């Protein structure tokens, strides 16, 4: 299964994962594609922030789904 993650710059990456994969593992895939640490990644799908305690199936995320990557601000 392939999904899509859009950044703020504009470049859109494609990730090959499975419904079983959790958000913690999805962030690991982004780590190997952009170099951005999982600790500083915010994934937004369908207006909801994705938490590391749940998987992709918990958010009903599947094929051809588009995710939004936003960096963790430091205030």
């Amino acid at each position: 299964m392939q999904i899509f993650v859009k950044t703020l710059t504009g470049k859109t990456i494609t990730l090959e994962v499975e419904p079983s994969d959790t958000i913690e593992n999805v962030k690991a895939k982004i780590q190997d594609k952009e170099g951005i640490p999982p600790d500083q990644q915010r994934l937004i799908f369908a207006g909801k922030q994705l938490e590391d305690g749940r998987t992709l199936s918990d958010y009903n995320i599947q094929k051809e789904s588009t995710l939004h990557l936003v960096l963790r601000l430091r205030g």
Partner: protein, 319 residues
């Protein structure tokens, strides 16, 4: 020579543990807190004999089970981090301006001020996790140490370190529920695939990340369907006690000579790639709460992040 202590992880179930004065607490038992202080790397003394200790690791089977019921499913380092954060943030203070409580600036905690002050405006919310709800009720009572430390622990925040208010806010809200009804219905349609409604209920229907205005939330979207054809989406039903919209810091001019609809909002000051500063604001004039510093302005050039709207009662015929 030897002492006995009472070990607990919940303050209700205790077990006796025998210790000598040969090795450290950590060596004999594990990471332990005594009246809030971590004494793991000290030698047991007669002065602590019979006293109660809070254990953070090397838990028994019973303690682990009670831990999961009390705090939910947490990582092995959670309890230590929570206990440690509690000790660290004990010196933090709330400033009270006209009954309104605001967290005083200290150790880069401004993002926490924005999170907490926003939470304080959200009616009919509660937490499922007993410890979190208990700390929440204490917070509303005037003692916020437990709640602050807990959400920092759940949010994996580090004492003294700058952090993201929106990220923490939605993390905390993901653990909460509404004490009333709420509903949000998206309608998607495509001439080939058909009409599809996406329903959200409860707290989930009161929060959205990606939009910061009611107008943009109710706007019709147009994109490409899975079949490759033209697909649309539009909000057709929204009934909430309140509405929290969150997005990236975008610069605008907020004025009260226009009579806005929103009740409150958070602002990120500084550049987004470096260490900035959060400020919480409410409209009652714009009441600004800068970590204990309170001021009023007619207008304000700022980069809004989270926005809080009143109750929604909306339906669209979608045409």
């Amino acid at each position: 020579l030897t002492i006995e202590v009472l070990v607990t992880v919940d303050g209700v179930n205790f077990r006796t543990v025998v210790l000598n004065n040969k090795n450290t607490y950590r060596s004999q038992l594990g990471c332990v807190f005594f009246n809030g202080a971590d004494i793991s790397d000290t030698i047991p003394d007669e002065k602590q004999n019979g006293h109660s200790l809070y254990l953070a690791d090397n838990l028994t089977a019973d303690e682990t089970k009670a831990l999961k019921e009390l705090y939910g499913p947490v990582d092995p380092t959670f309890l230590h981090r929570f206990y440690s954060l509690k000790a660290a943030v004990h010196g933090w203070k709330m400033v009270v301006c006209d009954k309104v409580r605001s967290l005083k600036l200290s150790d880069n905690n401004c993002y926490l001020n924005a999170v907490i002050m926003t939470l304080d405006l959200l009616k009919d919310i509660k937490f499922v996790i007993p410890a979190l709800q208990h700390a929440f009720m204490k917070h509303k009572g005037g003692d916020s140490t437990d709640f602050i430390a807990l959400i920092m622990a759940y949010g994996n925040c580090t004492f003294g370190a700058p952090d993201d208010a929106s990220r923490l806010l939605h993390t905390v809200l993901a653990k909460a529920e509404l004490c009333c009804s709420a509903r949000m219905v998206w309608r998607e349609w495509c001439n080939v695939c058909g009409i599809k409604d996406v329903v959200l209920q409860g707290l989930k229907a009161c929060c959205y990340v990606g939009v910061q205005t009611v107008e943009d939330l109710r706007a019709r979207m147009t994109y490409v369907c899975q079949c490759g054809g033209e697909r649309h989406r539009q909000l057709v039903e929204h009934t909430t006690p309140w509405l929290l919209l969150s997005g990236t810091p975008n610069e605008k001019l907020v004025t009260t000579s226009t009579a806005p609809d929103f009740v409150a909002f958070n602002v990120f000051q500084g550049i987004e790639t470096a260490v900035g500063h959060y400020v919480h604001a409410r409209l009652k004039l714009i009441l600004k709460f800068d970590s204990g510093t309170v001021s009023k302005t007619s207008d304000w050039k700022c980069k809004v992040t989270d926005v809080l709207f009143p109750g929604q009662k909306y339906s669209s015929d979608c045409n």
